[PDB]
Amino acid sequence: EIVYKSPVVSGDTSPRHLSNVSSTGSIDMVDSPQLA
Amino acid sequence: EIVYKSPVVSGDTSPRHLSNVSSTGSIDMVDSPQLA
Amino acid sequence: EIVYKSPVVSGDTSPRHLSNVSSTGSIDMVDSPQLA
Amino acid sequence: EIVYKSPVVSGDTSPRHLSNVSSTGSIDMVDSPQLA
Amino acid sequence: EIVYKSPVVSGDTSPRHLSNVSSTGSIDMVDSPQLA
Amino acid sequence: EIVYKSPVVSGDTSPRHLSNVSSTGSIDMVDSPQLA
Amino acid sequence: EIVYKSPVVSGDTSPRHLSNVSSTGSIDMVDSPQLA
Amino acid sequence: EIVYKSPVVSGDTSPRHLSNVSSTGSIDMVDSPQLA
Amino acid sequence: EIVYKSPVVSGDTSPRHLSNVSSTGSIDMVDSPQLA
Amino acid sequence: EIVYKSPVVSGDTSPRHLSNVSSTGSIDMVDSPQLA
Amino acid sequence: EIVYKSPVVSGDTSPRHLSNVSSTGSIDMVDSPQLA
Amino acid sequence: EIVYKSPVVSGDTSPRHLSNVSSTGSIDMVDSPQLA
Amino acid sequence: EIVYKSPVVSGDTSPRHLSNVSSTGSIDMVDSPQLA
Amino acid sequence: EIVYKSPVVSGDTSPRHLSNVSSTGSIDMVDSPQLA
Amino acid sequence: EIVYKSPVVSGDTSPRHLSNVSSTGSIDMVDSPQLA
RNA sequence: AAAAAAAAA
RNA sequence: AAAAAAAAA
């Protein structure tokens, strides 16, 4: 038994929010829960 | 048994929100729950 | 048994929301639940 | 048994919402549940 | 048994909503459930 | 047994909504359930 | 047994809604269930 | 002077190549200039 | 002078290549200039 | 002079290559200039 | 002079390559200039 | 002179390469100039 | 002269390469110039 | 002269490479110039 | 002359390489010029 | 003929 | 009838 690279992962992995935003001249809110 | 690259993953993986946004001249809200 | 590249994944994977948006001159909301 | 590239995946994969939007001069909402 | 490229997938895959939209001068809503 | 490229998929695959829309000067809603 | 390219798929595949729409000067709704 | 929706466009608009192709079990090339 | 929605565009707009392709079990090339 | 929404754009806009491709079990190249 | 939303853009905007690709079980190259 | 939202942009904006790719079980190259 | 939100931008803005890629079980290269 | 929010930018802005990549079980290279 | 928020920027701004990568079980290289 | 979703800290 | 492109540090 020889394994050279084994990143074994068992279970749950959750990356829920992924945003790539480029905004050169801007007013911007990223993932913002603004209320009232 | 020889494996050279084994990223074995068992279970659940959830990437729910993925946004690529380019907005050069803009007012912009990205994944924003603005309420009232 | 020799495997050179084995990204074995068993289970559930869910990428629910995927948006690619380019908006040069814009007011824009991306994946935004604006309420009232 | 020699396999050179095996991305074996068993289970369920769901990419529900996929939008490619280019909007140069625009007011735009992408995947937005605006209510009232 | 030699396989050179085997992306074996067993189960269910569902890409329900796929929209390619180009809208240069526009007000536009893409996959938007606007209510009232 | 030698197979050079085998993307074997068994099960169910459903791409329900596929729209290609080009709308240069426009007000447009794409896959939008606007109610009232 | 040598197969050079085998995208074997067994089961059910359903692409229900496919629309190609070009609308240069337009107000347009594509696959829109507008109610009332 | 009151206009409710005016997507006025003046000039030239050219959508030269528009193809809607559904091909369930197929080898297919779409708008492909294969040479030799 | 009151205008409610005016996406006025003057000039040239050219959407030359528009293809909607669904190909469930397939080898396919889309808008591919394969040479020799 | 009151205008409520004016995305005025003057000049040239060119969306040359627009492809919507769903390919569940497939080897596929999309907008690929493969040479020799 | 009152304007409520004016994303005025003057000049040239060019979104040349726009591809929406869903490929569940696949070997795929997207906008790839593979040479020799 | 009262303007409420003015993202005025004058000049040239070029979003040349825009790809939305979902590939659940796959070997895939996205916008890759692989040579020899 | 009262302006409420003015992200005025004059000049040139170029977002050349924009890719949104979801690849759950995969070997993948994104915007990779692999040579020889 | 009263301006409430003025992110005035004059000149050149260039966001050349923008990639959003989710790859749960994977060997992956992102924007990698691997040579030989 | 009253301005409430003025982030005035004149000149050149260049954000050349922007990558958002989520890779749960993986061997991965991000913006890596690996040579030989 | 369809759908969906989500989330969070 | 077309096209394109790019890039970089």
Numbering used by the authors:
A (entry chain G), B (entry chain C), C (entry chain B), D (entry chain F), E (entry chain J), F (entry chain L), ...: 391 to 426
Q: What do the paper's sentences say?
A:
The deposition of tau aggregates in the brain is also the pathological hallmark of dozens of dementias and movement disorders known as tauopathies, including progressive supranuclear palsy (PSP), Pick’s disease (PiD), chronic traumatic encephalopathy (CTE), and corticobasal degeneration (CBD). Identical copies of tau stack into long β-sheets, which in turn mate together tightly to form steric zippers; these fibrils are a common feature of all amyloid diseases. In vitro, fibrillization of recombinant tau requires cofactors such as heparin, RNA, or arachidonic acid (5–7). To learn how RNA interacts with tau at the atomic level and triggers fibril formation, we determined the cryo-EM structure of the fibril of recombinant full-length tau induced by RNA.
To discover how RNA induces tau aggregation, we determined the cryo-EM structure of RNA-induced full-length tau fibrils to an overall resolution of 3.4 Å. The twisted tau-RNA fibril exhibits a pitch of 829 Å. It is composed of two protofilaments related by a pseudo 21 screw axis. The protofilaments are composed of flattened tau molecules stacked in parallel, in-register β-sheet alignment. The fibril core spans 36 residues near the C terminus of tau, from Glu391 to Ala426, and encompasses five β-strands (β1, Glu391 to Val393; β2, Ser396 to Ser400; β3, Asp402 to Pro405; β4, His407 to Ser413; and β5, Asp418 to Val420). Notably, this region of tau has been characterized as a disordered fuzzy coat in all previously determined structures of tau fibrils, which includes the ex vivo fibrils from AD, CBD, PSP, GGT (globular glial tauopathy), and CTE patients as well as heparin-induced fibrils. Stripes of residual cryo-EM density run along the length of the two tau protofilaments, resembling RNA strands on the fibril surface. The density is not sufficiently strong to clearly distinguish among the four nucleotide bases, so we modeled polyA and polyG (separately) into the residual density. Notice that the polyanion RNA interacts with tau basic residues of Arg406 and His407, thereby stabilizing the β-arch motif (residues 408 to 421) at the C terminus of the ordered tau segment. Our RNA-induced tau fibril is stabilized by five steric zippers, referred to as A1, A2, B1, B2, and C. Based on these findings, we conclude that RNA-induced tau fibrils are reversible amyloid and disaggregate when RNA is digested.
